[PDB]
Design a protein around this ligand. Structure first.
Ligand SMILES: *[C@@H]1O[C@H](CO)[C@@H](O[C@@H]2O[C@H](CO)[C@@H](O[C@@H]3O[C@H](CO)[C@@H](O)[C@H](O)[C@@H]3O)[C@H](O)[C@H]2NC(C)=O)[C@H](O)[C@H]1NC(C)=O
Ligand SMILES: *[C@@H]1O[C@H](CO)[C@@H](O[C@@H]2O[C@H](CO)[C@@H](O)[C@H](O)[C@H]2NC(C)=O)[C@H](O)[C@H]1NC(C)=O
Ligand SMILES: *[C@@H]1O[C@H](CO)[C@@H](O[C@@H]2O[C@H](CO)[C@@H](O)[C@H](O)[C@H]2NC(C)=O)[C@H](O)[C@H]1NC(C)=O
Ligand SMILES: *[C@@H]1O[C@H](CO)[C@@H](O[C@@H]2O[C@H](CO)[C@@H](O)[C@H](O)[C@H]2NC(C)=O)[C@H](O)[C@H]1NC(C)=O
Ligand SMILES: *[C@@H]1O[C@H](CO)[C@@H](O[C@@H]2O[C@H](CO)[C@@H](O)[C@H](O)[C@H]2NC(C)=O)[C@H](O)[C@H]1NC(C)=O
Ligand SMILES: *[C@@H]1O[C@H](CO)[C@@H](O[C@@H]2O[C@H](CO)[C@@H](O)[C@H](O)[C@H]2NC(C)=O)[C@H](O)[C@H]1NC(C)=O
Ligand SMILES: *[C@@H]1O[C@H](CO)[C@@H](O[C@@H]2O[C@H](CO)[C@@H](O)[C@H](O)[C@H]2NC(C)=O)[C@H](O)[C@H]1NC(C)=O
Ligand SMILES: *[C@@H]1O[C@H](CO)[C@@H](O[C@@H]2O[C@H](CO)[C@@H](O)[C@H](O)[C@H]2NC(C)=O)[C@H](O)[C@H]1NC(C)=O
Ligand SMILES: *[C@@H]1O[C@H](CO)[C@@H](O)[C@H](O)[C@H]1NC(C)=O
Ligand SMILES: *[C@@H]1O[C@H](CO)[C@@H](O)[C@H](O)[C@H]1NC(C)=O
Ligand SMILES: *[C@@H]1O[C@H](CO)[C@@H](O)[C@H](O)[C@H]1NC(C)=O
Ligand SMILES: *[C@@H]1O[C@H](CO)[C@@H](O)[C@H](O)[C@H]1NC(C)=O
Ligand SMILES: *[C@@H]1O[C@H](CO)[C@@H](O)[C@H](O)[C@H]1NC(C)=O
Ligand SMILES: *[C@@H]1O[C@H](CO)[C@@H](O)[C@H](O)[C@H]1NC(C)=O
Ligand SMILES: *[C@@H]1O[C@H](CO)[C@@H](O)[C@H](O)[C@H]1NC(C)=O
Lengths: 273, 595, 277
């Protein structure tokens, strides 16, 4: 009547999500041409992202950072781009400015986390790193999650711009000046945005289900895949099929279950009273 | 579609481009100043030429936006600061002639030598020889010879150059819709479009004259005391009724009376507060000096210094292999980079200078949150005032004994207080009548109230009436004595010093009243006063976006400059001078002359 | 890129009465020496199953039937092959670029499982080339989809090389498949039984084991079978003609909700089944 131990068994954590591909990417894109990598059909370990002091901002909107590994989703979008330091807070639900209106805008009901870190050691070079650009002028604000790769001359006045720059005719894309001697605020900050989407499709991306150690000849409650029972687990002499997870006796009661890590059959006996 | 939206778009494009361009130009200038060579100078020249061409193009582009249709004050101020086509309204030949005149006057002032009449093989230069003779020498004949030689060898050469310079500047000012060049200079104090905070151009002259009339008694008492003290060193050269001679003021021109402290010291038996020995026995360094300055600033309530300021500035002399200019300057690169160029030695003077430069850097970081054209002080004297108030608050004995330089058992005697007040007077109030007279002479020679055949005549008349200075020998119309100064021979304004002298004491009194400090004003310390820090940051944040009158009202509570804080700063010294001038004749008479 | 196929005489579709085949494991529960009753999507023991022929006569019907068949609740796909003619299937709703579809195909090196909104064609098929120079086939001309965009699922297996030669004789291979789409999961069952027949697969019992469970929230309404074609020097034709189809035939049976009594033995394998209808 006293289940002391509580064991949790689950299959091995394989097929990790390619977070190191978007986080440790060599070449990032500009804020106007941000990449949108799709993350699905993998286990996303968000503990390695939160437990890392390299990131300056780890704000999560509509979700808690600790409970990230305890939730499932259908697909995650990773929006990676380089932004200036003094405009990192513009990447947030309900913010205005030049980046949040003309380059990248988040919806008011955005559910996800924004991650950013200083990249002055990589994206800054002596003489000026003019490889990153940002859209400075646009006729209207952007919709949530919308790209704009247009290079049309911004017509700021009534005079029609004949595809050339001049009076009231400015180029929409302007390049950042990233020198290694710039102070905090003007230094390049690589920022990634993890957008969580939940649809009617089955949940493909979940958190890594932790696994505990086994115990034999003790009354312990168990949980392998969905079986929440209580009994004594001992080694069995039967052999299941290569696909059958658990079994049951003639009385329609859980009798045995295959361990998702060792592929061994363990008998289940109810603790006597 | 409207003109205001097009102006805002153009201003955004300008703030994007000019920021990076000026940052590159400032990087080149910093690499040249911290490392003198043949490549850094070429890089700096190229960057400066590119920046000048960019500014000219942007001004010619912005001139197509009317200023009467803009209703936003910020955009209007940015456009007005950008449409300043000063050196481009004149003809090409006239502009080239004016530039040639400026260059030749700068070279005459810089490359100006004078040889001894008995030693033609060795001549004297201004900085090493003439300043030394006028400062540390006591012989009447030697100082008179040096003064006459400087006024004759260089003054006479700049007479036709200045006669053409004034005409060209008047033409340029009239082309820019001004009355004269003095009006163009006073336009820096002009603010319009704000109800109650307006300030015209003649009102500046009126306020300066009123402040000078209110400060005249203190200067007259100080002049009487200095004359009584100098009568001992010169028994038969200075009269107790007449004015002081021009070459016996401790300076080449009589601007600062600091070098007269060794002769006019009230109590010579007690030495001045000098913590240099206490600084060298505690194993101090320039790094420690700047760390203590940062500690003071963060105790006041201002943010720390950036990491780039500590990992990029050159706070000490690099050595003999690398040459650099050892002039303390605060560098604002523009893109969040702030540095200080100073060959800091272990000295109390360098301590106060480091506090001044860090105050400049704090002002820069405070107004860095505004557009490029507005990233500047509210007036041409706010930066120096913000630096000097910190330099004064750091030099108090209370702050020194709280840091650890001065012993805690050191008692505050009134004799040392009087000596410190007299030094501050000689270095601050001594240049106020000189600045006023020089600026008034320049204003009246630009407006046209002085004919060309009476320039030096009226100059000496004013210097004998307004100031207590009389010329030793008569100088006719060929001895252009006024043009012997750096600021007048290099096209630099001078009323900024008077304005900053008023502003520093106004700010000091305001921050001391906000710090809940009682007693005299000169013994006030605002180190641990966060209220005064916030009250000053409310003014440093506005920068140039708001009129200087609004900034003044935010920092002191009045929209006009007042001289009463300056008189309250020297109240004990005023009483002591009135007590020491019972038998002496206060004032001066213009009929006396050393002829 | 797609090329249609001509010189294909139309013949009336044949039907074959299926035997007790089609029973699979409805769950992953182990049972031994018991008769369990299940109510799930199964196949009746005797129903009309459409027989599709793929042969190539020597002269005076060339049949390459691979039409778009409906998917009501689940299909039973049985393959009687001798040279691996069937490469895979194309599941979806309209097989257009407006809706997502399921692409399962084996190109002799990997098992490609992609879920994207492809742009399929009327006659999607693979081809081999009987090259007498090197005595090798080296299949090519993968003509299944022309425009691939917006992929949400992708899976490839380890590289291999299956037998692509054209065997002569009888059908020495039987591959049975049962496809189900419930709760957004696409369940695939498989069973391989070596047989030796020419037509009308013999009566027997084979419990299909669960192979994969692909989570894809897509609607499956119609599906098309991906076959293969042989080409050599003795094939008159340039673009649409000049090909021959090896001896192969597949069967398609639709599932219906019924009650079945599954008989398990001492090893947890289904031996017999009883249909209640
Ligand atoms: C989940 O991962 C664990 C840890 O990797 C697996 O446990 C171990 O798996 C190996 C391989 O199947 C078992 O065999 C051992 O292999 C090593 C290396 O070849 C060899 O040196 C040993 O002598 C032994 O043969 C091993 O017994 C097993 N347990 C331990 C304690 O190592 C587990 O199998 C994985 N489960 C799944 C479902 O992938
Ligand atoms: C990007 O690369 C860095 C560098 O390797 C990864 O940081 C490592 O994280 C692991 C996780 O436990 C630590 O054990 C290593 O010590 C870390 N490296 C260093 C140098 O400290 C980082 O995890 C990578 N990003 C992702 C998303 O995986
Ligand atoms: C002049 O234009 C500026 C825009 O550059 C206005 O500044 C805005 O002020 C409002 C309210 O104070 C803020 O919410 C905006 O964020 C400001 N825009 C910025 C900082 O870009 C300013 O208010 C305008 N002047 C007047 C008198 O309306
Ligand atoms: C401002 O506040 C600081 C911190 O409270 C004062 O520094 C302390 O002064 C006392 C008095 O001598 C010392 O006993 C402490 O050791 C000092 N603190 C530290 C960390 O050294 C400071 O005296 C105050 N006043 C000024 C003018 O700075
Ligand atoms: C193959 O034949 C068909 C019909 O004879 C050609 O027409 C296509 O038919 C399908 C379905 O009926 C449509 O989805 C296509 O849009 C049709 N195509 C065109 C161009 O109308 C088809 O074009 C033929 N294939 C080739 C490659 O010619
Ligand atoms: C398929 O089911 C039908 C139902 O009776 C049967 O085949 C039909 O036979 C008649 C008799 O000539 C034809 O007219 C129909 O066209 C046939 N229908 C189909 C679908 O084939 C028979 O029970 C089943 N077919 C076979 C071959 O057994
Ligand atoms: C069978 O299909 C697979 C997947 O479509 C092919 O594998 C890819 O082939 C392309 C083109 O050769 C390569 O760029 C990829 O790197 C391959 N990916 C993998 C995971 O192998 C394979 O080449 C095809 N084989 C044949 C014979 O057509
Ligand atoms: C047999 O050898 C031939 C000789 O080249 C090759 O087949 C051709 O290879 C060339 C080179 O890429 C291409 O024209 C085609 O890939 C092939 N053409 C034909 C008509 O087969 C290849 O090495 C071998 N081919 C086979 C099928 O085994
Ligand atoms: C100063 O400039 C010279 C000339 O290029 C160079 O050799 C030297 O390294 C520079 N000094 C420093 C400290 O960079
Ligand atoms: C200089 O600027 C003023 C107004 O700022 C303008 O009236 C004048 O035309 C400009 N000069 C030239 C040569 O365009
Ligand atoms: C300045 O730095 C000190 C220590 O280096 C810290 O205690 C203080 O909070 C900082 N002030 C800021 C960041 O405003
Ligand atoms: C200084 O204080 C002493 C003692 O109170 C007094 O005798 C002396 O007159 C004072 N001197 C001045 C100049 O105030
Ligand atoms: C891809 O298809 C999915 C199906 O719902 C849709 O939500 C998504 O927007 C599509 N992506 C595109 C068209 O880029
Ligand atoms: C599938 O069909 C259901 C109802 O028939 C519909 O609600 C749903 O939107 C469909 N899904 C797709 C992807 O077409
Ligand atoms: C069942 O398994 C036993 C061994 O566990 C084996 O001997 C027997 O042949 C198997 N029977 C069937 C029908 O698979």
């Amino acid at each position: 009547v006293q289940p002391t131990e509580s064991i949790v068994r689950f299959p091995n954590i394989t097929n990790l999500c390619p977070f190191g591909e978007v986080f440790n990417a060599t070449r990032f894109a500009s804020v106007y041409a941000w990449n949108r990598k799709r993350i699905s059909n993998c286990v996303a370990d968000y503990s390695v992202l939160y437990n890392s002091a390299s990131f300056s901002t780890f704000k999560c909107y509509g979700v808690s950072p600790t409970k990230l590994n305890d939730l499932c989703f259908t697909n995650v979008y990773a929006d990676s781009f380089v932004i200036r330091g003094d405009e990192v807070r513009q990447i947030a639900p309900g913010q205005t400015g030049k980046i949040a209106d003309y380059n990248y805008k988040l919806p008011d009901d955005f559910t996800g986390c924004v991650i950013a870190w200083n990249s002055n050691n990589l994206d800054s070079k002596v003489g000026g790193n003019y490889n990153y650009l940002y859209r400075l002028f646009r006729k209207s604000n952007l919709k949530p999650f919308e790209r704009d790769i247009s290079t049309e001359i911004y017509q700021a006045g009534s005079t029609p711009c004949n595809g050339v720059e001049g009076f009231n005719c400015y180029f929409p894309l302007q390049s950042y000046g990233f020198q290694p001697t710039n102070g905090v605020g003007y230094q390049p900050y690589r920022v990634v945005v993890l957008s969580f989407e939940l649809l009617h499709a089955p949940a493909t991306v979940c958190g890594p289900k932790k696994s505990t150690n086994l115990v034999k000849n003790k009354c312990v409650n168990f949980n392998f895949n969905g079986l929440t029972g209580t009994g004594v687990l001992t080694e069995s002499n039967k052999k299941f099929l290569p696909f059958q997870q658990f079994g049951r006796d003639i009385a329609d009661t859980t009798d045995a279950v295959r361990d998702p890590q060792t592929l061994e059959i363990l008998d289940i006996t109810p603790c006597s009273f | 579609s409207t003109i205001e939206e097009q102006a805002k778009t153009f201003l955004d494009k300008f703030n994007h481009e000019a920021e990076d361009l000026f940052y590159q130009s400032s990087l080149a200038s910093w690499n040249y100043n911290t490392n003198i060579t043949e490549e850094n100078v070429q890089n700096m020249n190229n960057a400066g030429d590119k920046w000048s061409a960019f500014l000219k193009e942007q001004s010619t582009l912005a001139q197509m936006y009317p200023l009467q249709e803009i209703q936003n004050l910020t955009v209007k101020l940015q456009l007005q600061a950008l449409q300043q086509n000063g050196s481009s309204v004149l003809s090409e030949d006239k502009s080239k002639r004016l530039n040639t005149i400026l260059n030749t006057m700068s070279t005459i002032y810089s490359t100006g030598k004078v040889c001894n009449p008995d030693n033609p093989q060795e001549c004297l230069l201004l900085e090493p020889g003439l300043n030394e003779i006028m400062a540390n020498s006591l012989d009447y004949n030697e100082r008179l010879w040096a003064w006459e030689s400087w006024r004759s060898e260089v003054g006479k050469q700049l007479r036709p150059l200045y006669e053409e310079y004034v005409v060209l500047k008047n033409e340029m000012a009239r082309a820019n819709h001004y009355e004269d060049y003095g009006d163009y200079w006073r336009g820096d104090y002009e603010v319009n479009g704000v109800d109650g905070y307006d300030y015209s151009r003649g009102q500046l002259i009126e306020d300066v004259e009123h402040t000078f009339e209110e400060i005249k008694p203190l200067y007259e008492h100080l002049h009487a005391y200095v004359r009584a003290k100098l009568m001992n060193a010169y028994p038969s050269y200075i009269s107790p009724i007449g004015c002081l001679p021009a070459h016996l003021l401790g300076d080449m021109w009589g601007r600062f009376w600091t070098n007269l402290y060794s002769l006019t010291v009230p109590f010579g038996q007690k030495p001045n507060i000098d913590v240099t020995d206490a600084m060298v026995d505690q194993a101090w360094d320039a790094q420690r000096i700047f760390k203590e300055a940062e500690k003071f600033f963060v105790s006041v309530g201002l943010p720390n210094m950036t990491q780039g300021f500590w990992e990029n500035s050159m706070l000490t002399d690099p050595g003999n292999v690398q040459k650099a200019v050892c002039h303390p300057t605060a560098w604002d690169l523009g893109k969040g980079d702030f540095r200080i160029l100073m060959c800091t030695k272990v000295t109390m003077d360098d301590f106060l200078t480091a506090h001044h430069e860090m105050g400049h850097i704090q002002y820069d970081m405070a107004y860095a949150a505004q557009p490029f054209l507005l990233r500047n002080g509210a007036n041409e004297g706010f930066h120096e005032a913000v630096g000097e108030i910190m330099s004064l608050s750091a030099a108090t004995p209370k702050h020194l004994k709280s840091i650890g330089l001065l012993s805690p058992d050191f008692q505050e005697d009134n004799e040392t207080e009087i000596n410190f007040l007299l030094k501050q007077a000689l270095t601050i109030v001594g240049t106020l009548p000189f600045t006023y007279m020089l600026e008034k002479w320049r204003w009246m020679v630009f407006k046209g109230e002085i004919p060309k055949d009476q320039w030096m005549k009226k100059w000496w008349e004013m210097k004998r009436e307004i100031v207590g200075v009389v010329e030793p020998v008569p100088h006719d119309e060929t001895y252009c004595d006024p043009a012997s100064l750096f600021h007048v021979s290099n096209d630099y304004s001078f009323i900024r010093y008077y304005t900053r002298t008023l502003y520093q004491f106004q700010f000091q009194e305001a921050l001391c009243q906000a710090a809940k400090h009682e007693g005299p004003l000169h013994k006030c310390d605002i180190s641990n006063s966060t209220e005064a820090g916030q009250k000053l940051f409310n003014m440093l944040r506005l920068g140039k976006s708001e009129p200087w009158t609004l900034a003044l009202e935010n920092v002191v509570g009045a929209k006009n400059m007042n001289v009463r804080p300056l008189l309250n700063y020297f109240e004990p010294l005023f009483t002591w001078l009135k007590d020491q001038n019972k038998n002496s004749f206060v004032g001066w008479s213009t009929d006396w002359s050393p002829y």
